[PDB]
């Protein structure tokens, strides 16, 4: 469904921090002994509104709370770290996890190559 | 039912639970994102007591707390010391692991007390506490905090701050008094008006023209002097 | 295999209760300061033993528990949350964790509705 | 190895780990389920002295916790409180987020003293201890709960609670003595025969015909007066 | 990529413990309360250097460190145990993260024995 | 970006990220396995001396833990109580759960003091401190552990310990003093070349030929009398 940002206003540019877990650090600065304190482990970066994402972003995450709080509530879990991964598992199973039909629209593969590959051969034959 | 952002048409959108977009790429677990955007960007007022007036104190509901892996620079967070009058804190100690918030222009520190008439302080409109890439539902002490909420999105394939000082009575009520800190025994009855630069130039003018207490005691000043931050009395005039 | 109930009595009926994390609260009441409390979160429901499926379930949570008991024993994690994402994983590789070779017993690929495509393209040529 | 039950031919089974049933549909991770089943609806006796033989005391193995998301309305459940002779706790408090089981008829408290001959008290039987969505290998100080069993599923595509106190002494071993509180100064010995609802006709008659103590002392009573609930000395006669 | 044993020395075996939670215990010692004690719940066993892999490993333990560090120092979570899992969820989404254009490198669906099915019900007709 | 150890050609080797190896199966979570091997393994020095020098005290970077699955039989562990000259402890407590590496040939225990200038101790070359398939980036208080680190693979489809102890001074400095205990009153200054085998044979011999302290003191004894583990003071010569 689409995002209407319905706010009574929009900062229209994301100044943002983040963790980059790649890092590939200069030298010995991966070795927790050695390596930034709990206050430098961040990056940082801009991000300005083209095709309104920044707007939309912003009207998409007040409008997932009240779904997400009614999930805290259900678990007995303290902390919860699963949800993006239950989302990855949700997209799998949505495509994979039953028998996938081919050319239905429930089944994500495309035989489109190997249409034209058994029928260059049924040319030839 | 937690809804996932994903980019169609040059626009962000929900993805349909009932749709399948097979032409909708997911190739790792890193195309997945969660953020955590402020309140303050959706144009709420951030002066502690319009702040503090959204927050409240509930008992018999566990508190829970959420992950999330990008935040946004805040131009206003908050951190909080209140006890109740007999001095029992209102407050819980942060949990192991979890930090303030790691990106805040000016840290509005509020010291004081009030009844805290509930085990936890929530939210009342639904909003999360954001701390360090971690969200709670409730307020911890001594723990700087920026108001927020949280998105889900599938991918396509210096810092400088600042504390500044109050101190409150009543809080977490109707009749909640507020005073900006100079020093020790100088202060400044707050307003809603005044911004966090105000108070920093009020606190400098104070500083310089020797409008400090230089007695023992207690001296609070009285001042009477639409736009988003991204675009022994007395009295002074 | 098949669940035999061996227990000495079985109580045909399952009062049961549960959370209902969907929710799609009435008006204000998902936000926490408002909602239930502790106690006030659980729904309820009522199920008979048609197809013998109650007195079925209570043998297999008595046959689970050996399975489950030696499982814990072998974790450190002191509170466990992710057994039926694990079993959703395992479902998924089950049937998508190697090459799907069509017509064979593991792949879960209909090629039916595109067999009958093809033959009917083949009709015409 | 952990089992999971499934629906075929109008019967469940569990699902052969070994055979590829390409027919079953899992089109979430909502279609998977667990559930706690009480020992109760297998026929197990639920009376007090009966349900406490069925625990004991271990060192050397750590306890576990996992969760179940749907349980089931129990008719006993139990809450301990014991101490050793020398007024040490034999139980741990619950840990942070464990709340006792939400729906019990009849909640049986026992306080009293044990030797408590180990770190924690175990199931002899394997079964678990259902809390509030949790169930544990073993049992917690002051926190009600279900003895019960955990399923896994593939789905396919008013509340009153009574609370019964007693006294223990020698818990937890062969020669256990259990007393039915009426009052701090009133009590009956207990005999595995009494049921929950005889307990609590047996506490209002002597409410009503004051047989309670009307002295300092301690009263004790004595009373010599196969169907499953879904379907100062004296005596008394 | 090739992995290349640099250490100044390598023990060529590895006598290792773990855990078996397969279990399937003898009577009643999968019971928490009558069986093992935390330490007799380990099994052992004993690899030599067949084919390099014990030395190979020693190196591959060695070299993981820093990206393992890397992860660590970015997670918020105090206990990490869903490496794994999440290492099999992108094995997943690796394959079947997108539509499987059959033929193509990057879709692990193998025609051969329907080819060869179409091919002599084309030899027929 | 984590490597994932898999078998091709007869040979370990890192799987390419990049490439998709349709031949590869996984078929259960359970082809996956994590496994923590010892430096031991690898030639690194294991006398007390040599390992503590690897160690080191630092603040503001928050412990982290990993599990892993399968371990190595350890030849060398230790095991610290490490107090600052006040008498504080320098190490935590072990977290609930956290249990010593289970398979050690030789205990180091070593008790003493050292300045402990930092929160925290870390292994200065990055590597990990195993507990009971625990990896933590830190040294628990009193809790036996091995230096190792911790690969993570695609599978294709008696017990005798002797613990020996030691004091320190200056523990995790330039100038730390370390003397093995033969009992409470008699310790021999510690060489780096004194292997474990050599400590408990100069131990035994020291009980037998009466070499241990006869009086209140402290006696202490010198002594000066390539090649891998799996292949009141005086003098004695
Ligand atoms: C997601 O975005 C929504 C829109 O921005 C947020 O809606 C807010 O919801 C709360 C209730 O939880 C409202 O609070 C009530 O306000 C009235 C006072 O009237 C106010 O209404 C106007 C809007 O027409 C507002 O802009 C003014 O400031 C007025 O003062 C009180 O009588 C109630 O008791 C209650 O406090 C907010 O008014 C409302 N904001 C807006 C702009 O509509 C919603 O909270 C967001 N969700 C999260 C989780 O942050
Ligand atoms: C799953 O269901 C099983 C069947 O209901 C449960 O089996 C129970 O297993 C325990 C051992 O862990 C047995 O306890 C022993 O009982 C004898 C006493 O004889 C009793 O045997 C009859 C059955 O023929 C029983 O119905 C009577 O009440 C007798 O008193 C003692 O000598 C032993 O020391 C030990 O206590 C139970 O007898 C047995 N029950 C039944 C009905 O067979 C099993 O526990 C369940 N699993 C879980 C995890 O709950
Ligand atoms: C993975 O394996 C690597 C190779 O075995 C390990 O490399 C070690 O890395 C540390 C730095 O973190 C080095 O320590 C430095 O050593 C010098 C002293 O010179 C030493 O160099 C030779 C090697 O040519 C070494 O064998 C001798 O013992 C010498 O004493 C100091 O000046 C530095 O300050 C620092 O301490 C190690 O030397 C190095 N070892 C080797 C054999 O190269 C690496 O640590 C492993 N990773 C993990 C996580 O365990
Ligand atoms: N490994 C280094 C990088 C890892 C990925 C990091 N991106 C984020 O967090 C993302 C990107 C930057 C920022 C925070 C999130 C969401 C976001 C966005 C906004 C609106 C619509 C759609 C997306 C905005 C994209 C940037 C660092
Ligand atoms: N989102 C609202 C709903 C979410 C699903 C909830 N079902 C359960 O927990 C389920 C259903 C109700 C109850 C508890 C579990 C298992 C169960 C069952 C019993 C025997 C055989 C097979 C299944 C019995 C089906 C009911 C509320
Ligand atoms: N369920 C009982 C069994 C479960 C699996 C257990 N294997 C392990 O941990 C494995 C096997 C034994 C050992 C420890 C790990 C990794 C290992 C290896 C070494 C070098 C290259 C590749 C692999 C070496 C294979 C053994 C007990
Ligand atoms: C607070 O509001 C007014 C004072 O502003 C007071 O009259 C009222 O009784 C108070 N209400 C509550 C709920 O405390
Ligand atoms: C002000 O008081 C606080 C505590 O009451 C104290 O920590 C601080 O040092 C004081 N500042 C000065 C300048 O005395
Ligand atoms: C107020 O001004 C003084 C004088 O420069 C300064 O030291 C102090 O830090 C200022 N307070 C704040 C909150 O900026
Ligand atoms: C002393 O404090 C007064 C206020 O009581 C302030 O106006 C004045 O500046 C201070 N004294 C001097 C000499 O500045
Ligand atoms: C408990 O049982 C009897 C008394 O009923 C007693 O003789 C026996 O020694 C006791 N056994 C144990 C193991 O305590
Ligand atoms: C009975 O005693 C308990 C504690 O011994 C106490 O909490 C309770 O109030 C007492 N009840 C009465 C009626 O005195
Ligand atoms: C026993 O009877 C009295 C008198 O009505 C009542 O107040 C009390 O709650 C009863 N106790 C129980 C356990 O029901
Ligand atoms: C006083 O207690 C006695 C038992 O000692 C009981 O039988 C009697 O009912 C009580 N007194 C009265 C007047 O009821
Ligand atoms: C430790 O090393 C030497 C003594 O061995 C000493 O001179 C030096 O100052 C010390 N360095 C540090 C960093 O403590
Ligand atoms: C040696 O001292 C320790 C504590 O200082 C004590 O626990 C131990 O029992 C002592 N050993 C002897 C033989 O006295
Ligand atoms: C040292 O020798 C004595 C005498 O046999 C023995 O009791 C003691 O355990 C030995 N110490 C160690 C660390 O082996
Ligand atoms: C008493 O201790 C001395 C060292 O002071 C040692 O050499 C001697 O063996 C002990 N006495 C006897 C009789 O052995």
Sequence with gaps: ??????????????????????????????????????????????????????????????????????????????????????????????????TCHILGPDCCIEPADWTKNITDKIDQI | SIPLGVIHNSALQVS????????????????????????????????????????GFRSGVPPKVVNYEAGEWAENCYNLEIK????????????????????????????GTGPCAGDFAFHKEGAF?????????VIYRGTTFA????????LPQGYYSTTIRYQATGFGTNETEYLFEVDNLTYVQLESRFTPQFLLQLNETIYTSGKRSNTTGKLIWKVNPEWAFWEXXXXXX
Tied chains: 1, 3, 5.
């Excluded at chain 1, 900062?11 to 010995?28: C, F, K, M, S, V």
Aim: charged share 20%; aromatic share 8%.
């Design chain 2, 147 to 154: 108001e927020g909420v949280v998105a889900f999105l599938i």
């Design chain 1, 1 to 98: 469904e689409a995002i209407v940002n319905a706010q009574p206003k929009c900062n229209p540019n994301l100044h943002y921090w983040t963790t980059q877990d790649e890092g590939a650090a200069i030298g010995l600065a991966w070795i927790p002994y050695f390596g930034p304190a709990a206050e430098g482990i961040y990056i940082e970066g801009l991000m300005h509104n083209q095709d309104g994402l920044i707007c939309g972003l912003r009207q998409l995450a007040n409008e997932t709370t009240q779904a997400l709080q009614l999930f805290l509530r259900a678990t007995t879990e303290l902390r919860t770290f699963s949800i993006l991964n239950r989302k990855a598992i949700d997209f799998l199973l949505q495509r994979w996890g039953g």
């Design chain 2, 16 to 55: 349909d639970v009932d749709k399948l977009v097979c032409r909708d790429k997911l190739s790792s677990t890193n195309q997945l994102r969660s953020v955590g955007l402020n309140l303050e960007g959706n144009g709420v007022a951030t002066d502690v007591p319009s702040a503090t007036k959204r927050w």
């Design chain 2, 129 to 137: 506490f954001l701390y360090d890439r971690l969200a709670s539902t």
């Design chain 2, 84 to 111: 109740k009058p007999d001095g029992s804190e209102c407050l819980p100690a942060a949990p192991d692991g979890i930090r303030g918030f790691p990106r805040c222009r000016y840290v509005h520190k509020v010291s």
